[PDB]
Design a protein around this nucleic acid. Structure first.
Ligand SMILES: [Cl-]
Ligand SMILES: [Cl-]
Ligand SMILES: [Cl-]
Ligand SMILES: [Cl-]
Ligand SMILES: [Mg+2]
Ligand SMILES: [Mg+2]
Ligand SMILES: [Mg+2]
Ligand SMILES: [Mg+2]
Ligand SMILES: [Mg+2]
Ligand SMILES: [Mg+2]
Ligand SMILES: [Mg+2]
Ligand SMILES: [Mg+2]
Ligand SMILES: [Mg+2]
Ligand SMILES: [Mg+2]
Ligand SMILES: [Mg+2]
Ligand SMILES: [Mg+2]
Ligand SMILES: [Mg+2]
Ligand SMILES: [Mg+2]
Ligand SMILES: [Mg+2]
Ligand SMILES: [Mg+2]
Ligand SMILES: [Mg+2]
Ligand SMILES: [Mg+2]
Ligand SMILES: [Mg+2]
Ligand SMILES: [Mg+2]
Ligand SMILES: [Mg+2]
Ligand SMILES: [Mg+2]
Ligand SMILES: [Mg+2]
Ligand SMILES: [Mg+2]
Ligand SMILES: [Mg+2]
Ligand SMILES: [Mg+2]
Ligand SMILES: [Mg+2]
Ligand SMILES: [Mg+2]
Lengths: 169, 386, 62, 98
RNA sequence: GAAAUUGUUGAAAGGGAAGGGCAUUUGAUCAGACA
RNA sequence: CGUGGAGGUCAGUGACGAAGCCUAGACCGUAAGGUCGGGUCGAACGGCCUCUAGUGCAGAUCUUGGUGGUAGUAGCAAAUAUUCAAAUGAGAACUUUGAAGACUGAAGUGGGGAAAGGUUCCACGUCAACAGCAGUUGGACGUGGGUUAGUCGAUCCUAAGA
RNA sequence: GUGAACAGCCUCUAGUUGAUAGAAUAAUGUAGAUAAGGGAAGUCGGCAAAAUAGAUCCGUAACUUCGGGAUAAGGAUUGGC
């Protein structure tokens, strides 16, 4: 399959992807950016600590009118959360990518997250009922997730001046 | 158009903003004017608020209805263990304001002060002031040279002192460090006085005395987020009011098209720095003295501590200051006692005060006994003791 | 397992409400195979399914 | 290690000011927190007999004091059981021999 | 398999909007004649 | 100047890649526009002389379709209330069983019917969608089973009326 | 069962235990409440709230179509054994 823009050697990389996953796009984007560029082992341990509310996922873009916590100090922000559902989907794809790297024969110690990208999948429609007999939409925002792990001229005057200096010192 | 009836404004605009204080220890922003023809002495002292009680005394006020008659007054007790001098600081005059030139510390510092320099004391290696103490390892050239600079250039001298919080029933273990100005004597005399008091203790009776007016500087009790009705004292709206009645109805006219700074708004109440003046000292107690709470008329042997101990504080085992009236701040909070900035002679000051009785009944309820001995005499013998 | 249908049949066979039917929690596998009313009758006979006593409404104070 | 001790928990000061409809459920969570403090185990299991003792007097009739038997078993978990005593007053922590 | 709109990567600017006109500096990029 | 179609002509271009689309790459024209290179793509299309029109959009609270900021925000707070353990399962605050605490309190949250609905009844299998959290559960999904009358009704009689 | 009672309140038979949850307890709300002294000064206006309340006994005015007004007004009593 065709992935996004990458600048890594395909012979030293393994990839995994998931499509039409019914998980929040905005929550998943923040989670994906939290482990982008990290080592595979450190990222996996970090995601487990998020599920136990020991460390938080910083929210940088889709963070309007959310709460603020002290666990954001590690990343230099005030607003952070613990998107458990998004974390579990990412953990599954990290496990699959590591398995694919093992099948190739790559060194698991040197593996780091070189590429990770979240796209918006087509929405699923439901209805909600409003006052005075009106109907509004009630829709989800699924996600497409993909990731890749990789092993770590002179003028005559100028020529004359240069030659003149050579015979001087 | 003009408001139909005229009323005074709600609140005082000179105490803005109503924000939380920057530190739990309130700052002393003014010291008494120095008199160089006096011996060197401190101008302030540090203590911890313990609680309030009641006293009875005669009134000496000619022309008053209650002249030569007993009155009942409320007082506040401040636990004041001796403070320890641990350094001096010199200041010089500049067209931009006073500037600190140098700071000289004592050779040895206890663990109380060192805790102030850490956030994770139980994990640290306690390396603070380890290389500075090596300055004393020589003959003292480094320390003496720094002291000479203060004498040569400084125009204001202050000393660094800390409380002995380990003597209080508090559980903090961390001392409070502060600067206190020295008044009296020349600049050289102030520096010599500070040097000789390194690692020494200064008692409260060496600073204040009986029948003296003092100022109390402390952070008030905090109450969190408060509405306009209680934060500013605005009138409650009628019962018919839709969308709530603990509000201000109109927060501004159409023009200027902005909410003005002088309109009451909801926000933080309490935890503000305050400076209350003209508080007379009623008693300067001694910790090592039995019958702290005794007078010349009562003669019973009882301490200042009420039965059951001060509520939420504990027992008073050190020197204390008894001050008339109420003081900003709550119990357990560090307070600063400051000498008066002016000579008051309103005939309320300069009046000699002699206590005739001090209440020591329990403050945990409607106490009926001053001492356990009095309780046993009234009730007799109980099943518990037999 | 899902013994919702067994409790419905037991109440009808015994003749009491579902609130008075007791199913042995240690015999779930045996109860799960009782899909007929005749099989329910056997479990009542051997004590796997029992009828619970009625709640007492005493008139002594009355 | 494997150790068994008998404790007295003061539920009166842990349920002070709690809503009536939540007092009995709150006492269950306080006991789990109580066992974690003394045993250091995240997994705490309560016997249904203890659950009956908590709910003996309804949702808002939790006893002031309870005598608990806490056993740490084999990575490790705690098992809390009631202790049948006439009164829970005046009892201090003791180690129960296995 | 276009646009609105979106993700990743790369480059650049940002003290209460952004965008534009004339002129040149700097960076990037590029055609024409070697008669 | 540009667009759909028509007569004539260039024995015009093309699967060795036509049309379309993308391209802070190049050239021509004051401009409407025209031309070239690169990428993508797969079957038709253009120059010139003339003919013809359902022939050029930024707006009309324009029509149809699609998509944003708002925003992970408002909110998911009536009807007293849930808790422990085991079993099942990849997964259990919500499924099953047991234990405990509660409620409807016979003008009921009980047991039957009329109108209306039409298989929702029951069993087995099963969880993508639906049950505005969840789900191993379901009035959901897939496949089957089930309604037995001389006496209960219809059918017969007449009422206002047709 | 209580009571005059198919009222309200508690229980047996039977049936449910369903309504997104966890933590915390700021302001402002919605719903439910209490207040020293004064007692409608509030307000268009007693709006809202408070006070009265069952039963037994005593006592009951103007007026009137003689039927009423009337539970007028105004007082006392109430458990258990
Ligand atoms: Cl609509
Ligand atoms: Cl003012
Ligand atoms: Cl042109
Ligand atoms: Cl409120
Ligand atoms: Mg905002
Ligand atoms: Mg909000
Ligand atoms: Mg609605
Ligand atoms: Mg409707
Ligand atoms: Mg209104
Ligand atoms: Mg008190
Ligand atoms: Mg296609
Ligand atoms: Mg686009
Ligand atoms: Mg082509
Ligand atoms: Mg473009
Ligand atoms: Mg084709
Ligand atoms: Mg047209
Ligand atoms: Mg248009
Ligand atoms: Mg126009
Ligand atoms: Mg429009
Ligand atoms: Mg919200
Ligand atoms: Mg609501
Ligand atoms: Mg409810
Ligand atoms: Mg009820
Ligand atoms: Mg009831
Ligand atoms: Mg069914
Ligand atoms: Mg759902
Ligand atoms: Mg679901
Ligand atoms: Mg179906
Ligand atoms: Mg009152
Ligand atoms: Mg009036
Ligand atoms: Mg008025
Ligand atoms: Mg009214």
């Amino acid at each position: 399959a065709r992935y996004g823009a990458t600048s890594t050697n395909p012979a030293k990389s393994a990839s995994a992807r998931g499509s039409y996953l019914r998980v929040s796009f905005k929550n998943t984007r923040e989670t994906a950016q939290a482990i982008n560029g990290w080592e595979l082992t450190k990222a996996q341990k970090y995601l487990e600590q998020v599920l136990d509310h020991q460390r938080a996922i910083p929210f940088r873009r889709f963070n309007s009118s959310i709460g603020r916590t002290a666990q954001g100090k590690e990343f230099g922000v005030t607003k952070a959360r613990w998107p458990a559902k998004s974390v579990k989907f990412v953990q599954g794809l990290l496990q699959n990518a590591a398995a694919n790297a093992e099948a190739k024969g790559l060194d698991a110690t040197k593996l780091y997250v070189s590429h990770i990208q979240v796209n918006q999948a087509p929405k699923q429609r439901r209805r909600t009922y409003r006052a005075h007999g009106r109907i509004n939409k009630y829709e989800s925002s699924p996600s497409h997730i993909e990731l890749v792990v990789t092993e770590k001229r002179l003028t005559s005057r100028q020529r004359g001046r240069i030659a003149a200096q050579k015979r001087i010192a | 158009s003009h408001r139909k009836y005229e009323a005074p404004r709600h609140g005082h605009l000179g105490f803005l903003p109503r924000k939380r204080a920057a530190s739990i220890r309130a700052r002393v922003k003014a010291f008494p004017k120095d008199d160089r023809s006096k011996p060197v002495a401190l101008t302030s002292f540090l203590g911890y608020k313990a609680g309030m009680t009641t006293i009875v005394r005669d009134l000496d006020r000619p022309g008053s209805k209650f002249h030569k008659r007993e009155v009942v007054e409320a007082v506040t007790v401040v636990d004041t263990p001796p403070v320890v001098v641990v350094g001096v600081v010199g200041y010089v005059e500049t067209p931009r304001g006073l500037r600190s030139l140098t700071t000289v510390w004592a050779e040895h510092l206890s663990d109380e002060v060192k805790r102030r320099f850490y956030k994770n004391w139980y994990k640290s290696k306690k390396k603070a002031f380890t290389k500075y103490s090596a300055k004393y390892a020589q003959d003292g050239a480094g320390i003496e040279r720094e002291l000479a600079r203060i004498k040569k250039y400084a125009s204001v001298v202050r000393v660094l002192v800390h409380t002995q919080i380990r003597k209080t029933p508090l559980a903090q273990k961390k001392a409070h460090l502060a600067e206190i100005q020295l008044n009296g004597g020349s600049i050289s005399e102030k520096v010599d006085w500070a040097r000789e008091h390194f690692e020494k203790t200064v008692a409260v009776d060496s600073v204040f005395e009986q029948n003296e007016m003092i100022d109390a500087i402390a952070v008030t009790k905090g109450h969190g987020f408060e509405g306009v009705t209680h934060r500013w004292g605005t009138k409650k709206l009628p019962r018919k009011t839709h969308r709530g009645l603990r509000k201000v109805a109109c927060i501004g006219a159409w023009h200027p098209a902005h909410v003005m700074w002088s309109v009451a708004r909801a926000g933080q109440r309490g935890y503000h720095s305050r400076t209350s003046i003209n508080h007379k000292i009623y008693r300067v107690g001694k910790g090592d003295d039995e019958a702290n709470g005794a007078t010349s008329f009562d003669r019973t042997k009882k301490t200042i501590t009420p039965m059951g101990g001060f509520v939420h504080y504990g027992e008073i085992k050190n020197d204390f200051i008894m001050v008339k009236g109420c003081i900003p701040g709550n119990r357990k909070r560090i307070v600063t006692l400051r000498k008066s900035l002016y000579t008051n002679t309103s005939r309320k000051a300069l009046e000699e005060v002699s206590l005739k009785w001090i209440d020591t009944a329990s403050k945990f309820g409607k106490g009926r006994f001053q001492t356990p001995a009095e309780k046993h005499a009234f009730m007799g013998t109980l099943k518990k003791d037999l | 397992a899902n013994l919702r249908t067994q409790k419905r049949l037991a109440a009808s066979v015994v003749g009491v409400g579902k609130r008075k039917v007791w199913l042995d929690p240690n015999e779930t596998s045996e109860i799960a195979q009782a899909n007929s009313r005749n099989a329910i009758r056997k479990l009542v006979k051997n004590g796997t399914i029992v009828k619970k006593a009625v709640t007492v409404h005493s008139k002594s104070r009355t | 290690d494997v150790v068994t001790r008998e404790y007295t928990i003061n539920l009166h000061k842990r349920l002070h000011g709690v809503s009536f409809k939540k007092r009995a459920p709150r006492a269950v969570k306080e006991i789990k927190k109580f066992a974690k403090l003394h045993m250091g185990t995240d997994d705490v299991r309560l016997a249904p007999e203890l659950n009956q003792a908590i709910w003996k007097r309804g949702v808002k009739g939790v006893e002031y004091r309870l005598r608990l038997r806490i056993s740490r078993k084999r990575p490790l978990f705690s098992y809390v059981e009631p202790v049948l005593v006439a009164s829970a007053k005046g009892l201090q922590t003791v180690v129960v021999e296995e």
